[PDB]
Amino acid sequence: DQVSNLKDVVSTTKALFEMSKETAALEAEAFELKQKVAVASEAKSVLDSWV
Amino acid sequence: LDWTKIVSKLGLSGQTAAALTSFKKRNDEAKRILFELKQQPSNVDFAFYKSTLKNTAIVDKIQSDVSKFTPSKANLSKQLNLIESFEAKALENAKETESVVLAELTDLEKTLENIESXXXXXXXXXXXXXXXXXXXXXXXXXXXX
């Protein structure tokens, strides 16, 4: 139980840095995709109403 | 990549159940947000917008500024709070097993060879190993409690 806990605590400690970096990297991709889709939808709605 | 080994990574205490559930929910929602969204910029159909608008030079000026650069909710790697905590946690858990977990394996191998083996001389060495084995059994129940 103590030998199996050595590899489990070492893997759980390193997983905290990867989980926090994955959430921060996904937030930048979601904000850039939502901002680019908002400018494309606003330009397409204004062009469809003008046409 | 381990649900099989990631959920059983904690010890006997149930205090790590709240921390493990929050990390698994944030990791699953991060991959679903990048896959559901488009992996490109924007279309910006300027060929049908500049000729349909009533105002002259209206859709042409807005298409050049949107295709350049703008701001987004991003951050840098300066606040490495989780990166510094990974090295400190391994010194008290992974590095601590070299003197606690490794010492139990060496004591168990010497006690098994002395209790199974010359006669009266080997019985004296096995007597001291029996006391250490009995104390380890009582400490094993206290470590899980």
Q: Given its phi and psi angles, is residue B10 left (phi above 0), alpha (psi -120 to 50 degrees) or beta?
A: beta
Instruction: Give the per-residue SS3 of B7-74.
Output: CCCCCCCCCCHHHHHHHHHHHHHHHHHHHHCCCCCCCCCCCCCCCCCCCCCCHHHHHHHHCCCCCCCC
Measured CA to CA in angstroms, residue A12 lies from A7, B19, B91, B100 at distances of 9, 11, 13, 19
CA distance, residue B119 to nearest chain A CA (Å): 34
Residue B20, Cβ density class (10 Å: 0-12 exposed, 13-18 middle, ≥19 buried): middle
Give the 3-state secondary structure percentages of chain B, helix then strand then coil, rounded to 5: 55, 0, 45
Measured CA to CA in angstroms, residue B55 lies from A4, A38, A46, B50, B60 at distances of 72, 22, 12, 9, 10
Q: Give the resolution to one decimal, in Å.
A: 7.8
Question: Which contacts (CB < 8 Å, 24+ apart) does range B2-8 have?
Answer: B5/A8, B5/A11, B6/A12, B6/A15, B8/A8
Chains A–B, number of C-beta pairs less than 8 Å apart: 134
Instruction: Produce one character per residue of A18-27: b if its CB has 16 or more CB atoms within 10 Å, e if not.
Output: ebbebebebb
Measured CA to CA in angstroms, residue B67 lies from A41, B13, B20, B62, B73 at distances of 14, 54, 41, 9, 18
Residue B39's contacts (CB-CB under 8 Å, 6 or more residues apart) are A33
B144: helix, strand or coil: coil
Q: For B6, which DSSP code? A: T
Tell me which of A1, A2, A3, A44 to substitute to probe the interface with B (most B C-beta atoms closer than 10 Å). A2
Which chain A residues in 1-51 lie under 8 Å from chain B, judged by CB atoms? 1-3, 5-6, 8-17, 19-37, 39-40, 43-44, 46-47, 50-51
Q: Report the C-alpha gap between A44 and B49 in whole angstroms.
A: 8
Residue A5's contacts (CB-CB under 8 Å, 6 or more residues apart) are B11, B93, B97, B101
Residue carrying the six token digits 């921390």: B19
Residue contact B9–A8, C-beta within 8 A = yes
CA distance, residue B113 to nearest chain A CA (Å): 21
Closest to B45 in 3D by CA, of B69, B66, B72, B16: B66
B44 touches chain A (CB under 8 A): yes
CA distance, residue B115 to nearest chain A CA (Å): 24
Using the Cα atoms of residue B67, residue B69, residue B71 and residue B77 in order, give the sign of their dihedral. Answer: positive
Instruction: Produce one character per residue of B80-109: b if its CB has 16 or more CB atoms within 10 Å, e if not.
Output: eebeeebeebbeebbeebeeeeeeeeeeee
